[PDB]
Short mmCIF file of C-alpha atoms in Angstrom, two decimals:
data_model
loop_
_atom_site.label_atom_id
_atom_site.label_comp_id
_atom_site.label_asym_id
_atom_site.label_seq_id
_atom_site.Cartn_x
_atom_site.Cartn_y
_atom_site.Cartn_z
CA UNK A 1 0.00 0.00 0.00
CA UNK A 2 2.21 2.80 1.29
CA UNK A 3 5.02 1.31 -0.79
CA UNK A 4 2.88 1.01 -3.92
CA UNK A 5 1.92 4.68 -3.68
CA UNK A 6 5.49 5.64 -4.54
CA UNK A 7 5.54 3.42 -7.63
CA UNK A 8 2.28 4.99 -8.79
CA UNK A 9 3.97 8.39 -8.84
CA UNK A 10 6.99 7.31 -10.88
CA UNK A 11 4.65 5.70 -13.41
CA UNK A 12 2.67 8.89 -13.98
CA UNK A 13 5.98 10.73 -14.24
CA UNK A 14 7.60 8.51 -16.86
CA UNK A 15 4.29 8.49 -18.75
CA UNK A 16 4.96 12.12 -19.65
CA UNK A 17 8.55 11.49 -20.69
CA UNK A 18 8.83 8.70 -23.25
CA UNK A 19 5.27 8.60 -24.59
CA UNK A 20 5.52 12.35 -25.06
CA UNK A 21 7.62 11.68 -28.15
CA UNK A 22 5.82 8.57 -29.40
CA UNK A 23 2.93 6.47 -28.10
CA UNK A 24 2.86 3.78 -30.79
CA UNK A 25 5.75 4.76 -33.05
#
C-alpha cells in the first residue's frame, strides 16, 4: 500500500517522458 503509492507516482511521471515523443511509433 504505502510502498505502492510511490511506484504509482513514478509511473505517472515517466508516462509524460517517453510517450511524449511517441505512443505507438
